[PDB]
């Protein structure tokens, strides 16, 4: 051949079993609102109902784990202190 690849420097991103189809706290989805918001509008009045990403690569609705912080303080699928490293998908 005329051109051949010798080295590769790909970067691999990983995500845990967040179950994009069932929120691990509310069991609706990784998007499309939550149990306490339901309808899309539901008198939104600004604020937000996006996805929250932790330091453990877990994803839930911001509302779900914001409320869950009052019940416990360690991400339910593990035993790690939950951070708020990202907001939204």
């Amino acid at each position: 051949k005329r051109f051949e690849v010798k080295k590769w420097n790909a970067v691999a991103l990983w995500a845990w079993d967040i179950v994009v189809d069932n929120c691990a706290i509310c069991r609706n989805h990784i998007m499309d609102l939550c149990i306490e918001c339901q309808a899309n509008q539901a008198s939104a009045t600004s604020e937000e109902c996006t996805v929250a990403w932790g330091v453990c690569n877990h994803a839930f609705h911001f509302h779900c784990i914001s409320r869950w912080l009052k019940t416990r303080q360690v991400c339910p699928l593990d035993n790690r202190e939950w951070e708020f490293q990202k907001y939204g998908h």
Partner: protein, 77 residues
Amino acid sequence: PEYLSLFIDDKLKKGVKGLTEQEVETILDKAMVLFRFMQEKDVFERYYKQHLARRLLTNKSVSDDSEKNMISKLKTE
């Protein structure tokens, strides 16, 4: 006792029903309460050990946290 062991194995292999911890704790408490009014504990322990062997010598990462709860409940019961 064998059927109780099978039920606890089915509940422990995967928490697809009751993803959160509160209902899991309640159902485990109910199961151990039911086991309290039971005799012939030797066969129960034998079948529980067999289920442990089946669930540990197969695909891992079943619960990874509920084992401590199970051993604590067995200690207390």
